[PDB]
Amino acid sequence: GFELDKKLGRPHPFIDPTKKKQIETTLTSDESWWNWRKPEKEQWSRWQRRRPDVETVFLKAMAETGQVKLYGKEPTLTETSLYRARRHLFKEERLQAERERLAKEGPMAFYSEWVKAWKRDTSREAVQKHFEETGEDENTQLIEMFSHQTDREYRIMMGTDVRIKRDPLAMRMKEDQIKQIWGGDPVYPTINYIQAPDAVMDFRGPDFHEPTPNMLSYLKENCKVIS
């Protein structure tokens, strides 16, 4: 357990739970000065919620997958800073795992994730059977499979580009996890901001002043200038 995970760098508490002590009993607000007393009622702060960020979402995803383990369910700010310091190593581990999976399964099985219209069996044994029965080798079958891929699916698959190398954790991350990067839906609805790109401004709307009268016509209307 401890004293070995700490040596090897495996996930472990910063403070050993066995070598841990409580902080005894402190002042009870009856033996304390007025300026050091806890308020009777909790005070609204506007800082009472923890700020959302990328680190929290990625740490929660990695704790779900078991790559790292945290002290509790929600990563702390210390853990968030540590992840920000060491975040490239875990992404490299995920990328290497994806490369190993590609090498093991084969191109047909690996890239069929982004070709949903392909219903044939994509295992290496099935590919070899198809080659023996039809004479179409693995490359021909691969070209045939990519002929059913859509442009949306192809653009999603570009995260596997050897030059892009998108994080596999981010590629498979779901919308509910992604929204927590910025904290979810804004309380003020965006529909108030949205305007059509071809919209023509209605100058008789509720947000406009009354139509500006012609100055000469306004003077003549009030009977100030004769014809």
Partner: protein, 147 residues
């Protein structure tokens, strides 16, 4: 060009302990205002406390800004743009990732309301008006530094 350093919204890194320190300063300012209303402290004691507690908080964020960049995000674009000596100093980065601190009215005195938000978070309407005090000084002091 090959590295192509850039600047995003999440690259502007506030230190992890700002929310802890802002809440602490808010709790002490709430307690003193109640006891000032009770008549347990006088006006100068309240005026000094708000100025100095928020100046100490603002200056502590600036000190910890660099070790936070050096230990947790050494290749952060904001850090590299200033730590290398290229463009920008620690004071201007503090205006972006820490807090703008305290301003001053034209007749020397400091305003008894801190700007506890940085430019990434977005100044409130009250804070933006207060920050215009220093904007006016810079343009006016330019017209006398040259002449």
């Amino acid at each position: 060009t090959a590295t192509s350093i850039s600047l995003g919204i999440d690259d502007l890194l506030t230190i992890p302990s700002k929310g802890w320190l802002v809440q602490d300063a808010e709790q002490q300012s709430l307690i003193l205002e109640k006891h000032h209303h009770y008549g347990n402290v006088h006006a100068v004691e309240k005026l000094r406390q708000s100025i100095e507690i928020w100046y100490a908080t603002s200056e502590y964020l600036r000190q910890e800004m660099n070790p936070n960049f050096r230990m947790t995000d050494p290749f952060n674009p904001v850090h590299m743009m200033s730590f290398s000596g290229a463009r920008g100093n620690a004071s201007q980065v503090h205006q972006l990732v820490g807090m703008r601190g305290l301003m001053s009215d034209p007749q020397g005195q400091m305003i008894d309301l801190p700007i506890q938000s940085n430019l990434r978070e977005g100044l409130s309407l009250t804070e933006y008006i207060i920050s215009c005090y220093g904007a006016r000084k810079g343009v006016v002091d330019t017209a006398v530094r040259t002449s």
